[PDB]
Amino acid sequence: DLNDAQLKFANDVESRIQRRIEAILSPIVGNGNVHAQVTAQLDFANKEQTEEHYSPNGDASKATLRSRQLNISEQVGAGPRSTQRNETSNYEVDRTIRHTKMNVGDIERLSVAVVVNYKTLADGKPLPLTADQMKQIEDLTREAMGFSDKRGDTLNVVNSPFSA
């Protein structure tokens, strides 16, 4: 029931990422000379979070006060000195409440496998690509897939001649 809807959601996301990669990889490598497939680890767990933050007021310069009683006594007779300080302070503090409801269906970790073809010249020899072109393909695929390191995304692009 709901599981099938989630699976179809994942399939559509993967297909659209695949198409976005193919769109940029087509003009330079050529139609059919590139194949990519995407798998997506998604987030279907309902989470609700409330965050409370208090600004520190331990420093007297940023401390906000409402009432303060400072009783000071010094009975000098060091000799028979007698110092007494009774201090009472009531503070008002900065407060920030944030309520967050995470979206259901977010992407947790995306791994993408891309395979490119060789280059057959007018003679027909399948000449492999170069390192610079491979780096360009890797960068383009990283851009298309929305590659990020916080998610833990992995990308692998290899070059090999396609079968007949």
* Contact set for its own copies, span 117-156 (CB under 8 A): 117, 133, 136, 139-140, 142-148, 154-156
Cβ closest to its own copies, residue 101 vs residue 125: 101
Q: Compute the least distance from the CB of residue 146 to its own copies, in Å.
A: 5
Nearer to its own copies, 23 or 127 (CB): 23
- Distance, CA of 100 to CA of 79 (rounded, Å): 63
CA distances from 46 to 102, 106, 159 (A): 7, 11, 41
Using the rule CB under 8 A, is 75 a contact of its own copies? yes
Site string for its own copies, 2-41 (x = CB under 8 A): -xxxxx-x-xxx--xx--x--xx-xxxxxx-x-xxx-x-x
Minimum CB–partner distance for residue 135 and its own copies (Å): 9
For residue 124, the minimal CB distance to its own copies (Å) is: 15
User: What's the CA gap between 137 and 144, in Å, rounded?
Assistant: 10
Q: Tell the smallest beta-carbon distance from residue 119 to its own copies (Å).
A: 10
CA dihedral 51, 55, 57, 58 (to 10 degrees): 80
Q: Exposure pattern of 141-158 as b/e (b: 16+ CB <10 Å)?
A: bbebbebeeeeebeeebe
Instruction: Decide whether 95 or 125 has the Cβ nearer to its own copies.
Output: 95
Q: How many residues bind its own copies (CB under 8 A)?
A: 117
Tokens of 107: 């992407």
The SS3 assignment for 1 reads coil
Least separation in angstroms between CB 131 and its own copies: 14
